[PDB]
């Protein structure tokens, strides 16, 4: 149970992640991210972005976007 | 059909496919830790006199190159007898391309009919050459030469006058199809006398070569440098491994020569270009047995390493960094090939008898009842007083 | 037994006459395959006890005679017939025993 | 075989009658061919693999498999606990 | 005798090769050491070839999307990150994509430097709707897995691509032990997964050679007063008071300080050094 | 001269049976130091062989827990003293040695009569104390082995007592180079420098088997000869050679066809036969127009 807890305790957040108020790697698939971890390029709890090619099945707080960046050509980032 | 040509580029090795055949052997110095040798003398075999062979035949270089992940084709002729078919089988299993191998039903592999004179001093004057001396110009596989990006050959193919003309024809055709010409000297035993004969014999092929590899002993012989360093002395003094200045090898230079490689075994490899020159230190403390003592496996491994590097980056033939890397890669290939051959062949104890190195390093029990290391009866004891 | 000979001993042995084929094994001490060839030749010498004679010449000692015999490398065997009209056979490299038996019977 | 047993039990109304029927079929195998069972081929394993094959699926006979890398006779594979 | 063999091989796709290998017979404890070393060599010591930088020519206005291209700039970079290559190149070379207009841009459309080859020709790059010309310059490198940062050249609007150099996707080893009485014997299995830029058998060979090259260099050769204290010595007050200033009490500490060190401390003169040596010679 | 160098930076002799050495290797690429360090550590602690006394034979002793008149120590204490004696040898095999002494006095390791292949490391190592002019004859057996194991003596063959390594950054990230240090402690049967060289050689011999040809590559010292003997056997009882030993190189195929078959790893005649006609079309550049000309060559063969 301790091994799973340590494994899934994610990244440090907020004032525990940055000394100062701020006023990460992108991986194409999960195997590239795990391979970078094996080569000691990232740590077990270092945050990363994962390209997701399935449906949106991530358990998360039911919240609206923090920010929407809306380009005048029609693309928007939530 | 150049759209069907793959990577790495094909290399055509031209000449003879012999079995454990050595052209020559010269006294040599190798880098060695002599403190270790004294400590391990009772367990590590060493020759009384260190004599190194330049390498083997064109067939062995093809086999060594195929072992490095290269693409090698062997161009030659074998007889249709059982020995010729066994050698063809050995080349195919080693993944050497043998579509450039001509099988001769009329000639015999590894056998020549000589006419020995019984009048004055003994002479031989070959009459009917062996199968691997009878490749004709009509039998050259031009398709292989079209695909191949490098053409490799050695002096053994210049010894027979009929074989020499075929080698010259193959070289000239390969130059036309834009192949790099790699000339590996490997000077055969008769040529080591009468330097003037050697120069006349190799002069034409020498000027057509883009890359040349010689041993340090061969370079000294062609340059008229009499060996002045010591041999078989327990030190690694730098006079045994001297990097000759470029002007010392300038008389051998010609207009189209790109690189000259000078080998001192896996101990040291020197390189010379028009602009650059240098040397790379190696390692020659490999396991050696009486069956592998001439170090010909290293020479084939070294040349195969040079060929492999030069063919995959052919535009880097003058980059000094790539040349240093190429020389170090050749040293490693020679070391591994020598190391493997000791394991395969083993030690002396087709009736051929060999033992492993574990058996070679196993001592006798010293349990002789008369001997001083066992428990005698109470009669003959001589209890040593303390 | 395989006997070591000089160039003058071999000249006296070739110019003379014999009733069995003569095998001359050019060798050197520094050559690994020549040691393996020595093992094959002593097995052959036992098979053909008196039916043949096997001799060896050190090419380092006799480089003049090795060259005049057109030895181009090592190992090298000469199979010399006792019939003067028959021609000798030069083999190069480590050849299997059956080839030597074939040479001795079929053409020597 | 664990998944196969669960597969067979999905077609059974009562798991206790399934156990009895398998044992009854296994008893018949041993009487029919006594010497073939008790070693590498176990009768109960034969019954289960036969019943999976009767559904149209394919399984090796009695789930029997052997190590192909055994270094000759006398050698036992040793288990790392 | 110790021998190796391939017991399983498979090619699921052009970018998925699997191989299983056996090495036997090994003495106790040898298989673990070989398996550990080979696995580490397979995962980071084998050089792979990857696209490391992309540069969109024609001044595409530095936006997040390009007119005529269905995919955004970032998605093109992600697609380029996934293209499997093999090569023998030394240093770095440039490749180029130059596509006329509508259709599918794939790895087939990359113009490659001499030694570089493409493994899966059908790998997708971009969907082009309008008949626009797209011109992307690429940077191709060959690096080790455990390797490092290539020194930045950051201008001309070349987007970096964080490539993970791993031609070997995965590697594992297991050990079987056998015995007949007192005679033990272990067998080593090695499993290798590659992305098609290399066969599993070829990866096994390169890992062994790279390991051997790491250990050859070790075989290289080269061309050819405690119980005597300052107080018991009849020293002048100035000398003694200065010696305690540096926490020196025993004569071992006095002899553990160089003549240069003795001068550096405050209020010690050259004549003072001589007097100490004169007394030292007297005992 | 060499770019990558190694050197002993410290070599110390703590006692006759405790040697210390520290070595440096630099500059290394990132990750290479970790690979070398763990492999070297495992080889040093687990792959280096030693030699020591494996058993002792006593002349007039009931059991190993008795006492002898004239010896201060007991029989069991003697065996422990024999177990701690450090020997060196490069050769294998069960050797025998002898202790044949007359008291009174101090029996040490220098009183052992050793066979010519074996040497003592520490003369002063204590075996027994004799307080009476008695006769003591003890036979010994000696072996060179790995790991650990008349009266048997529990031999621990390993000569490396401990090892350590550290990895340090060489400097600015030109190529993030690293520096490796290796520390070795031995029992004097070999120096730390010799242990470092033996571990390197042992490691190479563990990795080089993968560079031999795969098992069952050649038909079964000189791998060419068995296939030749097969041909001699085939010549008698005229039988001809099987298609698995015939390679496509010996068929007169056009070069475009040959390159396609080799690209698909079809090497022998039997490999080509097992391929159907649909599979060959699946290969690029090999089409239906090429089947008939290839079939005709095989038809003619």
mmCIF file of C-alpha atoms in Angstrom, chain B residues 22 24-28 30 45-54 232 284 286-298 338 341-342 345-348, chain C residues 27-36 60:
data_model
loop_
_atom_site.group_PDB
_atom_site.id
_atom_site.type_symbol
_atom_site.label_atom_id
_atom_site.label_comp_id
_atom_site.label_asym_id
_atom_site.label_seq_id
_atom_site.Cartn_x
_atom_site.Cartn_y
_atom_site.Cartn_z
ATOM 1 C CA UNK B 22 49.107 -16.285 -43.559
ATOM 2 C CA UNK B 24 54.012 -13.209 -43.950
ATOM 3 C CA UNK B 25 55.214 -12.481 -40.438
ATOM 4 C CA UNK B 26 57.531 -9.737 -39.203
ATOM 5 C CA UNK B 27 59.074 -8.981 -35.794
ATOM 6 C CA UNK B 28 56.913 -6.516 -33.900
ATOM 7 C CA UNK B 30 53.254 -4.531 -28.768
ATOM 8 C CA UNK B 45 50.858 -18.071 -22.699
ATOM 9 C CA UNK B 46 53.265 -15.717 -24.441
ATOM 10 C CA UNK B 47 55.435 -16.294 -27.504
ATOM 11 C CA UNK B 48 59.186 -16.380 -27.060
ATOM 12 C CA UNK B 49 59.442 -13.922 -29.978
ATOM 13 C CA UNK B 50 56.549 -11.631 -30.863
ATOM 14 C CA UNK B 51 55.980 -11.853 -34.623
ATOM 15 C CA UNK B 52 52.884 -10.273 -36.164
ATOM 16 C CA UNK B 53 51.229 -11.155 -39.486
ATOM 17 C CA UNK B 54 49.606 -8.302 -41.459
ATOM 18 C CA UNK B 232 61.387 -8.510 -27.283
ATOM 19 C CA UNK B 284 47.321 -5.519 -27.519
ATOM 20 C CA UNK B 286 44.579 -9.947 -25.607
ATOM 21 C CA UNK B 287 44.446 -13.684 -24.813
ATOM 22 C CA UNK B 288 46.713 -15.449 -27.296
ATOM 23 C CA UNK B 289 47.246 -19.182 -27.694
ATOM 24 C CA UNK B 290 49.777 -21.104 -29.822
ATOM 25 C CA UNK B 291 46.990 -21.526 -32.404
ATOM 26 C CA UNK B 292 46.395 -17.748 -32.705
ATOM 27 C CA UNK B 293 49.873 -16.335 -32.061
ATOM 28 C CA UNK B 294 50.401 -14.602 -35.427
ATOM 29 C CA UNK B 295 47.569 -12.114 -34.659
ATOM 30 C CA UNK B 296 46.143 -12.334 -38.184
ATOM 31 C CA UNK B 297 42.617 -12.162 -36.748
ATOM 32 C CA UNK B 298 43.441 -8.676 -35.455
ATOM 33 C CA UNK B 338 41.529 -11.656 -31.703
ATOM 34 C CA UNK B 341 39.596 -16.505 -31.995
ATOM 35 C CA UNK B 342 41.448 -17.566 -28.834
ATOM 36 C CA UNK B 345 40.576 -22.369 -31.206
ATOM 37 C CA UNK B 346 41.842 -22.991 -27.675
ATOM 38 C CA UNK B 347 45.240 -24.455 -26.789
ATOM 39 C CA UNK B 348 47.266 -27.476 -27.891
ATOM 40 C CA UNK C 27 56.340 -23.982 -41.605
ATOM 41 C CA UNK C 28 57.476 -21.324 -39.162
ATOM 42 C CA UNK C 29 57.418 -21.187 -35.378
ATOM 43 C CA UNK C 30 55.347 -17.989 -35.260
ATOM 44 C CA UNK C 31 52.351 -19.288 -37.263
ATOM 45 C CA UNK C 32 49.358 -20.592 -35.330
ATOM 46 C CA UNK C 33 47.782 -22.613 -38.164
ATOM 47 C CA UNK C 34 51.134 -24.314 -38.808
ATOM 48 C CA UNK C 35 50.813 -25.824 -35.323
ATOM 49 C CA UNK C 36 47.358 -27.181 -36.201
ATOM 50 C CA UNK C 60 62.564 -18.691 -41.458
#
